[PDB]
Structure 1
Amino acid sequence: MRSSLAPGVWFFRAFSRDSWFRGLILLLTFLIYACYHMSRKPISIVKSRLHQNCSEQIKPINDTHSLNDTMWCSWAPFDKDNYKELLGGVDNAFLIAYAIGMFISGVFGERLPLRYYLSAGMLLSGLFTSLFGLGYFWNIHELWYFVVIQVCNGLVQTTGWPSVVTCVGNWFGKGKRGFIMGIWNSHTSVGNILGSLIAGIWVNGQWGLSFIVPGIITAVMGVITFLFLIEHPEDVDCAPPQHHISFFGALRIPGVVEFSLCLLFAKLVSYTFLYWLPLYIANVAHFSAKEAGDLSTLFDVGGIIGGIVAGLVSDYTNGRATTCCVMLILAAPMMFLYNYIGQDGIASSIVMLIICGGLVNGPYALITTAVSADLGTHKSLKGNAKALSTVTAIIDGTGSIGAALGPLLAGLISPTGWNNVFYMLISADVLACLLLCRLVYKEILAWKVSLS
């Protein structure tokens, strides 16, 4: 009768029954959509391996050249002078089929059960990623094989996000916001920050195992999701969350017509860093393809902090739009200085990657809730759920056209120098920071009430 309860189980018994079921559904859907971004990454890390320089390459013992070849280093379709323009098509042959997939998944998406539709997405997303890596063993040398695998990997892998938002919205109720779901939104950057560390291993050597291993980890987390997913909280009998064509008319609203071209510009800037940075940092600093991949991750370790800090500060100050304009208008001088003096001493680049990763990938997770907060208050009121569904089908529609216009435009300027790429990416942030004609003009208008 002398020994009391231990501190561990006395801590663990404080939490209610509901607060464990709304607590493991964050740990499930964290590791689901992190494993999606781990799958999408290694096409962007192996680009400095499919074409390379035979001058620094040692001569082979096995005679596979004809003494004037210099094409036995390169993989075979990516061999000529256009190794940057024939690869910028393979980069968005995934993204165009992804942008069509997000639009079709707004029709045939709710008509299937969620656990049978998310787990058959993570299995056919781990199949088609690895058929891209089995091209190394079957030594297929054709451009028309590596594209159809991408156009079918883009159309399958769109089952990830519109299932995760419903699985969390059934437990928490359409737009929670706090410190916990500020941590949960780093699930799309943890995926990139360990999709480069895992895939990087096999690069120098047999690169076919850079696509097979993240094509099997996604296939196993497609089984774990099939065994342990709970859609609606009435299943385990927990508590429900506590509650709170017309297209031509939709262009007449003073809303969408200036935010559709603000999600187009924002994602340009983020996705060209997602894809073409492990080739830039290998081409300028003259590293290998393991030192190019592992150095990039310091962009994402700033992308985490830029999502935490801008989420807290926009909760201390009411209105989540005036803290996006500051970071967008401040990102441009930092990436100009990073192109200016950021590739000689590593103490400069380890600072500059983290700063231009905080300032670019920060507001990316914030401007969507910022604009959806404004479009809730209109003459077309909150009761018209179909009207808000259609006018938020448009914004996230052109948001994914800004995806496909990123690396396609980056893979045609890049043979004319890298500096012209950063002029475009600096001009795009200032063209994207023109949301202030509406949201900032309303938010500073409502701060004079602090005088009263």
Structure 2
Amino acid sequence: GYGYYRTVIFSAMFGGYSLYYFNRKTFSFVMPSLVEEIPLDKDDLGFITSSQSAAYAISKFVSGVLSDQMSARWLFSSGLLLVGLVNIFFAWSSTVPVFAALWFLNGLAQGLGWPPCGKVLRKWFEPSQFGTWWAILSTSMNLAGGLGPILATILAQSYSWRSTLALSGALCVVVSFLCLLLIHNEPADVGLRNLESTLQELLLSPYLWVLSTGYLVVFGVKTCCTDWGQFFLIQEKGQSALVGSSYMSALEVGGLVGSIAAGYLSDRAMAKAGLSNYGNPRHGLLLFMMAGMTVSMYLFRVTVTSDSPKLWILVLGAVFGFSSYGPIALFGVIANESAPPNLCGTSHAIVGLMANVGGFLAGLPFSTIAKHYSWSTAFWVAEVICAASTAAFFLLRNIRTKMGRVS
């Protein structure tokens, strides 16, 4: 059928991108067994994970640019096969630069996998049903991150790290051929019906860069609170470490439900509206969630004391996680929808570049401001940036969103 093939292809992308994220962070999942086996420095593990982070940033960008050129099926399957071959060779490795370079090459093949999922979700799913299945295909990532330390801890208690990495790499090699056989990058290959723009016309469209600065700010404020919310509760607000861990756990669970609810309710808005070329029906919940970020950072900064209860901290974590991982899924969905259909992966990679810029701006200058002035001053600077960007994106909510040529 039609929806049958949508189900089959989404199950294949779900399994493939779940194995992507599990084999993206297996070395951090099997890390305790491996540091029991071989002694490695904290700076050594930081260099390995930083090699993967640098290669994954470069490869998200390069793969988004490539995914609009060659086929998403072969690119996805090649990514999964090459990730599996990396984990096979990584289980078959003992020396440290082999770990670092092979995990760099895993970071490349992990970047090489999600813009195929974006292209296939664009070409196969209606815009009334695009954000919700984007959000479930990122819930694949969240489910891999949730079931990864559990299964890796069981396989590291039972077997070694080499046997676990070898089984996971062999599983990716098998699922790479299964995703080569169960994915069609467009319905024109089957026979079903589908659903002229240059990269210069993409880059000169101002909505891509309004979207880029918006996702810069939203991912920067997400990474600010995700990295330093425990520290803001320990040093400044005077909570315990269990309260900070519960705050992070509530932010993650609220972020999972925030991404899913953002996709579903934004597809409801996209199904209701959709007559004009200017504006975007997804702004009508992207703006409410960015205002939710503003309200959550304000109420977490001024209405949190040492005497405020743990339930208020959990509510602020959950509502900020809702209001924060919602817009990240929405800037993904908009950078894939509002783009031309043959240049949507490139328009998504341009916004992931600003994800990298926001990650750096949340890492070093936010910690510098927190070191010099105070913690509440730094989180307030992040609040001002997020609220001023919520205002600047409320103003810019009705610009020409359909990127590309003008007709």
The equivalent position to 1:233 in structure 2, one of 184, 187, 190, is 187
Residues in 2 aligned to 1:165 and 1:350: alpha-carbon distance in whole angstroms: 33
The equivalent position to 2:255 in structure 1, one of 303, 308, 329, is 303
Matched length: 378
List per-residue Cα deviations over 1:326-352 (Å, max 9, x = no partner): 23213425765999769x998788766
Partner letter of residue 153 of structure 1?
N
Does the CA contact (< 8 Å) of 1:200 and 1:293 recur in 2? no
| TM alignment of 1:166-245, pairs within 5 A | 166-172=119-125, 176-177=129-130, 182-201=135-154, 208=161, 211-237=165-191, 239-242=192-195
Partner letter of residue 214 of structure 2?
C
The alpha-carbon deviation at position 365 of structure 1 amounts to 0.1
List per-residue Cα deviations over 1:150-185 (Å, max 9, x = no partner): 221111222211212222333236784465665444
Does the CA contact (< 8 Å) of 2:247 and 2:313 recur in 1? no
The equivalent position to 1:128 in structure 2, one of 82, 86, 107, is 86
Does the CA contact (< 8 Å) of 1:307 and 1:361 recur in 2? yes
- Counterpart in 2 of 1:58? none
| TM alignment of 1:282-361, pairs within 5 A | 299-314=251-266, 315-316=268-269, 319-321=281-283, 322-333=287-298, 354-361=318-325
Does the CA contact (< 8 Å) of 2:217 and 2:358 recur in 1? no
Q: Tell me, what secondary structure is at the counterpart of 2:389?
A: coil
Please identify the structure whose Cα radius of gyration is greater.
Answer: 1
Question: CA 1:235 to 1:205, structure 2 compared with 1: closer, same or farther past 3 Å?
Answer: closer
Question: CA 1:108 to 1:394, structure 2 compared with 1: closer, same or farther past 3 Å?
Answer: closer
- Counterpart in 1 of 2:217? 265
Partner letter of residue 29 of structure 1?
M
Question: CA 1:407 to 1:156, structure 2 compared with 1: closer, same or farther past 3 Å?
Answer: farther
Question: CA 1:334 to 1:401, structure 2 compared with 1: closer, same or farther past 3 Å?
Answer: same
Does the CA contact (< 8 Å) of 2:335 and 2:344 recur in 1? no
Q: Tell me, what secondary structure is at the counterpart of 1:326?
A: helix
Does the CA contact (< 8 Å) of 1:130 and 1:211 recur in 2? yes
The alpha-carbon deviation at position 207 of structure 1 amounts to 6.9
List per-residue Cα deviations over 1:125-155 (Å, max 9, x = no partner): 12224544555xx3x3x4x343212221111
Question: CA 1:345 to 1:146, structure 2 compared with 1: closer, same or farther past 3 Å?
Answer: farther
| Identity score, percent | 21
Q: Tell me, what secondary structure is at the counterpart of 1:362?
A: helix
Q: TM-score, normalised by structure 1?
A: 0.63
Residues in 2 aligned to 1:157 and 1:165: alpha-carbon distance in whole angstroms: 14
Question: CA 1:271 to 1:435, structure 2 compared with 1: closer, same or farther past 3 Å?
Answer: closer
* Uncovered stretches (5+) of structure 1, i.e. residues with no partner: 1-16, 52-71, 377-381, 446-452
Report the aligned-residue RMSD. 5.1
Residues in 2 aligned to 1:133 and 1:406: alpha-carbon distance in whole angstroms: 35
List per-residue Cα deviations over 1:23-72 (Å, max 9, x = no partner): 22222222221221222234445667888xxxxxxxxxxxxxxxxxxxx9
Q: Tell me, what secondary structure is at the counterpart of 1:304?
A: helix
The equivalent position to 2:354 in structure 1, one of 384, 399, 405, is 399
| TM alignment of 1:31-180, pairs within 5 A | 31-45=15-29, 75-78=39-42, 83=43, 87-106=45-64, 108-109=66-67, 112-129=70-87, 131-133=89-91, 138=94, 140=95, 142=96, 144-172=97-125, 176-177=129-130
Residues in 1 aligned to 2:302 and 2:245: alpha-carbon distance in whole angstroms: 22
